[PDB]
């Protein structure tokens, strides 16, 4: 069972934020909750995320390519296997993203952006029970 205000889908306690805040301060706002910035991989669970979501405000996900750019990981390391970039990401129709958008949000619709950090927006904060 999750706390409140949380919401469950299969083993995972998940947040959608009220507050809109830089990427890093988003960071670690779901770091001392003991979670971290969500992680989607699979189409299930993307398709349960975009349900949840009634207001149109984009959120920010666990997605990044600072450490090695255009090398898109989760803040776990990992690459993501299951993909859901809107049209033209990341790459930016090829002409690469510019610098300090290396930060991806979730978008009403569901699909994936890679927005500037820094750049204020809600969040999604998950953990595994
Ligand atoms: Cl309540
Ligand atoms: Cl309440
Ligand atoms: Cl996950
Ligand atoms: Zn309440
Ligand atoms: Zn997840
Ligand atoms: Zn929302
Ligand atoms: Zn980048
Ligand atoms: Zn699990």
Same mark, same amino acid.
């Not at 600072?66 to 993909?83: A, I, Q």
């Not at 699909?111 to 999604?124: G, K, L, R, T």
């Given at each position: 069972? +999750?706390?409140?205000?949380?919401?469950?889908?299969?083993?995972? +306690?998940?947040?959608?934020?009220?507050?809109?805040? $830089?990427?890093?301060?988003?960071?670690?706002? %779901? !770091?001392?909750?003991? #979670?971290?910035?969500?992680?989607?991989?699979? *189409?299930?669970?993307?398709?349960?995320?975009?349900?949840?979501?009634? &207001? *149109?405000?984009?959120?920010?996900?666990?997605?990044?390519? #600072?450490? *090695?750019?255009?090398?898109?990981?989760?803040?776990?390391?990992? #690459?993501?296997?299951?993909?859901?970039?809107?049209? =033209?990401?990341?790459?930016?129709? =090829?002409? &690469?993203? =510019?610098? &300090? !958008?290396? %930060?991806? &949000?979730?978008?009403?619709? =569901?699909?994936?952006?890679?927005?500037? +950090?820094?750049?204020?927006?809600?969040? $999604?904060?998950?953990?595994?029970?």
């Amino acid at each position: 069972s +999750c706390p409140p205000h949380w919401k469950n889908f299969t083993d995972k +306690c998940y947040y959608f934020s009220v507050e809109k805040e $830089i990427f890093e301060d988003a960071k670690l706002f %779901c !770091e001392d909750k003991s #979670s971290h910035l969500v992680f989607i991989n699979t *189409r299930e669970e993307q398709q349960w995320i975009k349900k949840q979501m009634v &207001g *149109r405000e984009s959120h920010w996900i666990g997605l990044t390519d #600072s450490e *090695r750019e255009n090398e898109w990981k989760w803040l776990d390391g990992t #690459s993501p296997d299951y993909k859901n970039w809107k049209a =033209g990401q990341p790459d930016n129709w =090829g002409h &690469g993203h =510019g610098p &300090g !958008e290396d %930060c991806a &949000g979730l978008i009403y619709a =569901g699909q994936w952006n890679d927005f500037q +950090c820094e750049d204020v927006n809600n969040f $999604i904060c998950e953990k595994d029970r």
